[PDB]
Design a protein around this ligand. Sequence first.
Ligand SMILES: Nc1ncnc2c1ncn2[C@@H]1O[C@H](COP(=O)(O)OP(=O)(O)OP(=O)(O)O)[C@@H](O)[C@H]1O
Ligand SMILES: Nc1ncnc2c1ncn2[C@@H]1O[C@H](COP(=O)(O)OP(=O)(O)OP(=O)(O)O)[C@@H](O)[C@H]1O
Ligand SMILES: Nc1ncnc2c1ncn2[C@@H]1O[C@H](COP(=O)(O)OP(=O)(O)O)[C@@H](O)[C@H]1O
Lengths: 167, 620, 625, 185, 195, 114
Amino acid sequence: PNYYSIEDIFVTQEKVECRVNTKLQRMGFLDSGAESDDLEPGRTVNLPLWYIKELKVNNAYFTVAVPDIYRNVHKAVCEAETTHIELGRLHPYFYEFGRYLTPYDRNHVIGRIIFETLRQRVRHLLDISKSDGQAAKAEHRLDNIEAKLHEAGVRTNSQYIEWLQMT
Amino acid sequence: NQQDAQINLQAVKKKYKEFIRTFNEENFFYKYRDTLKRNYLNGRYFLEIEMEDLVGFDETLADKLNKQPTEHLEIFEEAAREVADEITAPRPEHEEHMHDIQILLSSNANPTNIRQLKSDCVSKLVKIAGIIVAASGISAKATRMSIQCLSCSTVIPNLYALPRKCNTEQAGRPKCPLDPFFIMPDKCKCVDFQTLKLQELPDFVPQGEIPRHLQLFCDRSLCERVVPGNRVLIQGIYSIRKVGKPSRRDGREKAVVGVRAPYMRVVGITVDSEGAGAISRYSNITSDEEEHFRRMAASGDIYERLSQSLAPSIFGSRDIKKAITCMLFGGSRKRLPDGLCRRGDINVLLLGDPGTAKSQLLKFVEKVPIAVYTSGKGSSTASVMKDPQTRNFVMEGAMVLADGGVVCIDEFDKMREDDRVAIHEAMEQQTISIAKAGITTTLNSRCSVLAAANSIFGRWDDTKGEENIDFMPTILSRFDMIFIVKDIHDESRDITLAKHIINVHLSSNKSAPSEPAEGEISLSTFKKYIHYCRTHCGPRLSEAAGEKLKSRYVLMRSGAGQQEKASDKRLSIPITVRQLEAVIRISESLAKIRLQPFATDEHVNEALRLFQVSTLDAAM
Amino acid sequence: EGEQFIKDIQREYVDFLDDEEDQGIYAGHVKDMIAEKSKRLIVNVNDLKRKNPQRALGLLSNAADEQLAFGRALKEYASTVDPGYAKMHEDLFVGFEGCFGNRHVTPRSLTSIYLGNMVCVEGIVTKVSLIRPKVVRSVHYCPNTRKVMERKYTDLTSFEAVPSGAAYPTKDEDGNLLETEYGLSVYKDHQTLTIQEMPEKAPAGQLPRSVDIVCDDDLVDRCKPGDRVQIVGSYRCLPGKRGSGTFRTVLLANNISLLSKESNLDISREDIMLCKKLAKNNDIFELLSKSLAPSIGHVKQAILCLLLGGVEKILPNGTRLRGDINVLLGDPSAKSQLLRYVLNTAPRAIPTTGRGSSGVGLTAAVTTDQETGERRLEAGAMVLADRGVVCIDEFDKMSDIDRTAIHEVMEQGRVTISKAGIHASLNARCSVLAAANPVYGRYDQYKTPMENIGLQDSLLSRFDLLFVMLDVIDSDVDQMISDHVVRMHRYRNPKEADSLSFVSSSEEKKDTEVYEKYDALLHGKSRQRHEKILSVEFMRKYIHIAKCMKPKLGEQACEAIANEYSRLRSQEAVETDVARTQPITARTLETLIRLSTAHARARMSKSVTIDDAHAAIELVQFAYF
Amino acid sequence: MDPSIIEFIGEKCMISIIPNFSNEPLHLIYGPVGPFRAGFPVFVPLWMATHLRKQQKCRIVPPEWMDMDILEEIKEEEKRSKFFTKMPCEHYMVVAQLVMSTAPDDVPRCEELRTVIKDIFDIRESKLRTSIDAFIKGEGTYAKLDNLTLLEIHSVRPILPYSLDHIARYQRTATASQRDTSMLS
Amino acid sequence: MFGEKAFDLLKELERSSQTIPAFDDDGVRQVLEEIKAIFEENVAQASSYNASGDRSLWPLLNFRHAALQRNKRCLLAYLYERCRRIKALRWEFGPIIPGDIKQALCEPEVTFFNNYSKSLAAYMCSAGYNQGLPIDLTNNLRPPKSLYIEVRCMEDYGKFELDDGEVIHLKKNSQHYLPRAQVESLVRQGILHHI
Amino acid sequence: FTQHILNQEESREPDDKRLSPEETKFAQEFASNVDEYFHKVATQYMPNQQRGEAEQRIVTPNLMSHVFLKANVAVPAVIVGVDDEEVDMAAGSQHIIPYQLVADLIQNNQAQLI
Ligand SMILES: Nc1ncnc2c1ncn2[C@@H]1O[C@H](COP(=O)(O)OP(=O)(O)OP(=O)(O)O)[C@@H](O)[C@H]1O
Ligand SMILES: Nc1ncnc2c1ncn2[C@@H]1O[C@H](COP(=O)(O)OP(=O)(O)OP(=O)(O)O)[C@@H](O)[C@H]1O
Ligand SMILES: Nc1ncnc2c1ncn2[C@@H]1O[C@H](COP(=O)(O)OP(=O)(O)O)[C@@H](O)[C@H]1O
């Protein structure tokens, strides 16, 4: 049951820094037992996505909640640096997070940033048009959605070569 | 432009220009257009070429190319940019601006020797093979620029005279003579310049002499190309920088007639393939290679095959050798957010009766990516010199040349202690410190070391008790696996050693029937294999390994203390944190070999039995 | 006034000053209506791109006079706005600053490109150097005619052009008077220095390279050599290059980031409030004990007070004394790794070698044709650690030449030193550590307490305590230490009923799976703490005020110090410790004073208690007890 | 998208050639085939001259766009063809390869010819990179084919679109969905 | 590992590319000990007054849900790609030459192997002819050429050539009385890139 | 697409137009196989609600895989069945679009694919 993928469940997992407005109870997978069916209004928490995927963006059991990469400052200067914002692997996938997370902001900015980032791939792979040589070239500034088309375009050229004569 | 021969135009006119458009085989690969364009795409701005294509094309250029290459190899550049800028046009709209490029040359003709690089061999293309020592930093150079006085990009043939007239003459009759040149480096250019270096070979007239060497030059893309201590194949050119014979005799009492200086510039360095001559930093290796690698890693009969790689003429010492190579791979530099960068590399001891092939073995461990060997009386205080140009205090600082490599030495015993202490220390923290003159540059580098030695009194000390070292137990501390060498008698052993080496020592014997053994082959492969396997995997333990290893070290210290008590006096080696802190690196070396990240305690029972040699050695 | 796009560009910057952005914020109350008068304004390019990208990246490709025009248009703007500051008739260059990320190369990688660009550097403060003034223009005068002409001069390091070469005028018209008026003839400030890669990205198969820097007036010498730095400036290359002989580089047009302070922190009087809220908690000293060394038993309760420098005590035109603390003790295997808890944890932390000549504290000042006439100068390796502490390894392996050269300013707590060229003196009132070894390893207790070390017994009074460090285990504690050491080995590596995987979520993630390598909190929260109350930053954020507060003496100190020193000199030289009762003297008082002075700063109690008495004696007896 | 799948498309095209037989051990196929007489041209597909010339059965001649002057003027028109140019048979990049394998046993000037086809191929391709260099705001209702040929376009096909869906989903959702003041996904 | 093992589960096929020795039924036993390890808890609170209907469970429903999601659909892949590879090599041959082993059948793959073979068989019957000519599609691409001779090969194993021969020894030098219908199965599953 | 392909077919069960019957036998045979394979997984506790061919289990719903269209009609903008702005239609041209919006012209065969 998903927008399916071999990456079918890199989907509902990204952990957060979620705060608290009100009380909580019985944290379960945290250090919790028969110890706290009560906690404070105001505590930062790391949390998965699955149970909170369906927990009431309007309601406040939990609160305004972002990760810090996902905080707007670098993301803002990267809609001004939507030209060479460099990635690596500290945030390997950076492309469809908002493709869930956008409405939980309460500030209405996320998607514009992201779309601009990938309009840059509408400009980027101008340079990517060939497989020139041996094994590997540039294989760590990559989300694993660009990995797919990257390999794919490589293959396209790879077999275009065998076309190029009897080869 | 005197269109008779040697003309500026004929070459560029069509010949070089069309050589590549014309360079053809079906399969429609066989040009240099594809390589050029696909190089351009990724900012390369070069391409690779042969020198025996002209025979594929013609019979004239080459015997003209050797003569005045300095010009031909820039006509090449111009033809290159004009033949490539047409393709820079997808339509006329995406050459935002052109760009400059560098050509390469290569061949397989033959390497020469420095002893012959002579006045005939000058301004002339060549091939050699030497070795590298060190070379400069990365300064600067450019090609042209403008001047406000004339406002023209000053165009030059040579890579200075600046004549008289003003060119701000439109001042009336009040002109500005006597060279008023204001260089406008808003309008200048910039290429690279690095001054590579070259030592001669180890077999080609160093015999009753010493080896000379040579200094070099580069322009654009051969910086960041060569790290020193490497074996090169080269195409360069032998030319000068200054000029003059007549009685303008140089200096104060210099130059009887005309002596000007040597050097070479590179037109197309390449590298060596002494098996894997040049496999140290870059990767021209291909998917077949890596399949080979991992499928041998997939092979579960690789380590015992590798126990037989250094001894194809040597007998015995197999329990001794189950970790003589595990030293090479290194474990893990498992650093942490606090200081505790727990020790990465690995160190070994060995000492015992001579006649047991320590020297040749360490020569081979040098042979098999990066390493050095001296031994005693003297690689590396570290070196604070004072620059004879300008008299500044630079730091050559030579364990720096093991910044990932390893070291081997004997002759720790046979050199005094004024020089042991900086190296006593480096190999616990890997940070070469400095505090001497006006600098506090705590340098660092990841080297290991191998330690051979010689005990005075031999096996006498080894029969009875405590005369093991002559110097100290604080370097009995730093090493994990420590090995006696005896030559205890047995006639079977005697005869077998007898014929074993004679069958070696007869007629340069084993060419054909040597490699027919199983898989014990190609130290070249090991250069490549090592420089791979260390460069990827960063393993660390599995849970089930930790408790048994912990309890084992517990019982180790308890047995050492009991031998202390079973003799009523200290009978032990110090049960250190270093011993576990190193056996961890033995596990790490094993997992580095098979490439499985998470290592189990059966993987390391082998480690247990190998350092057990050290335990039962210092058991008495 | 070159090609006339320059003036278009001027007004394109004037077009910055329209509305809320700059007509509201950036123009007016910005340097001069606030009156600190830093002619170097604060620009960030991003707003300029948000107006004129032709002026954003037309700048970061060419900066011939776009800067000149920027400063011109700005001064004309404020000339409209505010003639009061119209008396600074100069360029008034600007920032063009930012923590942007266009291109931020190393000193290694200013590589044959970037010429004619405005870009970044990072690296080390090094060779913080000497100052001079510079020539602008000369207000001459003729009493003969009562005529004050003027003449400005340039050179490439300031802008492009060069003066139409000549010296200052004399009889320039025909023979009338040329009285050079100074004071009206003006001068900036000048400076010159270099940077190295904070190097640890360097490949030590290779050489960490160097750069070339120039600065100017309101930028003059803004940190010390021995610190970490990031900077952003423009680039130029003047010299001859075979038209005559090759080429060189230089950098300028910049503002700074020093990236290691606390005043860098956006500091209200609230951080003090957090400290003082938690300050009352009494047994926090033990938390700070387990704080800095969380990766190792063992001490640091005491080492803190070294880490706090000390306390100043001067008398009415009488003397002064040095306030700071110094100790050290041990066979190999946590001694040699308890020194890099400072090099990379706390500031002003400069380790030394154990092998050092002519600049452990010397300079030797050797000089060869400096740009100016400096006949003799260099600096040293101590003022780097002024007002703090120092590390060394291999001390017993140090020369016994300069050991006494330590004793000089160590015991004096003064500099009256020179290399025979000029008498020099200052106040560097420093502490230090080093490392140690018994000459034969496993010996300090069986044979003797002393003489397993083998050196002057003079220093032991210069330092504070004879102390102990050993390594053995009996039959029972071995598995206890085993479980301790195995906590060391596991509370560091990550990730530690029939089927328990395949949980609702997995390791499959987008962007928070493994940062570097994760760690545990299980049962170190049975230790009821937090990673922020027990941390680096809130720790260091409680550095400054304990260094600003000054806990004066009580009154009950005196009878107690009396009774305890009495018994100390009575019977500390008995019961198996006599040869470790050699250095007793009338010096335990001042160290006890530094002790309670420090400990009364760890909660900032400007006061004294008997509990502090126990705290400052019990370690001393625990040395052996 | 392949090297041969398009020859199921491209190689079925026809020229007219000369055989050295008349009607064979069989006369003729019930089909569009012409009557077989040696010494005279006959119209055939080009999946057979392949089979025939190497079967040592025939000669062959090309079309007329396989020349010099057409392939010297098409290029210079194509230079400022801001969109596209003259299209001689529209898949001549596959015919020419299956031509120039064997037939250059006797074809004329089979080298400068190749030079030009490469010279036109590369440029038209490269143009077909820079079309991308204006595509803003999700213009998936505006494109170019007008004198395109197919052997160039399949070299792109799988790359962009299997991305372009979720790429411009942020804006293709715009004319297909609704939200409050901000842009929707 | 918390729902990741399928990276390990299809690592059964790590060497089995086209240099395949054989195959097995990995990665089911302890992992489907889960499915019954957990339903207990997932339905522990079932229609209970243990909370009398409030917000508290609302993850736990989802805990179950995602656990199952991962489980079932991992499994979907675990058979699906197996169908895929076997189908590929079965496009290189009919069920004349069956699987390398027929021992890596995770039991319900009885249903699956047979189902796929015979769904395709049905579709075959429709295809080829209306009655159905299982029509040669991917092997024996001789144009009209010889009928009865043997040839040279490249060292096959599996030994599955039953067709019409006493023993043709389907390997290199499978060289015996080989008719045409004898040699009717294998073209590129590893033999005759070279006669 | 054994998931909701059945659903359009139970919308009409078209004639030889949409799908063909042997495909239907094939497909329901397969979906039975998947369920009776899941048999030997968790079928003491097969899904307690979402038991047979399920509600969120979908494979091929997506109809916006943006494909290339071939012109063949009036070289002016013969404006015809598609949701988008197919303004500027032609005869030998293309202005590329999604696919959902035209499952019309190719059932008319007014236009073609490439
Ligand atoms: N067991 C052996 N098998 C084969 N060759 C041997 C063996 N032992 C020694 N040799 C040969 O004898 C020579 C030994 O010289 P080497 O320099 O090793 O002395 P050594 O063992 O290092 O003694 P020392 O350590 O005192 O120098 C080598 O050339 C080696 O090839
Ligand atoms: N309790 C501990 N705390 C910190 N480190 C420890 C501890 N126990 C063991 N170690 C580690 O064990 C190793 C022992 O080496 P150590 O640094 O003590 O040598 P050393 O103190 O420099 O020797 P020497 O004092 O003779 O120079 C170190 O790497 C250290 O990190
Ligand atoms: N009679 C004394 N008068 C003053 N101070 C003394 C006396 N005896 C000991 N002290 C202490 O000794 C210190 C100075 O001693 P100092 O001369 O350094 O001893 P040493 O000669 O061992 O170096 C003073 O700080 C003071 O605390």
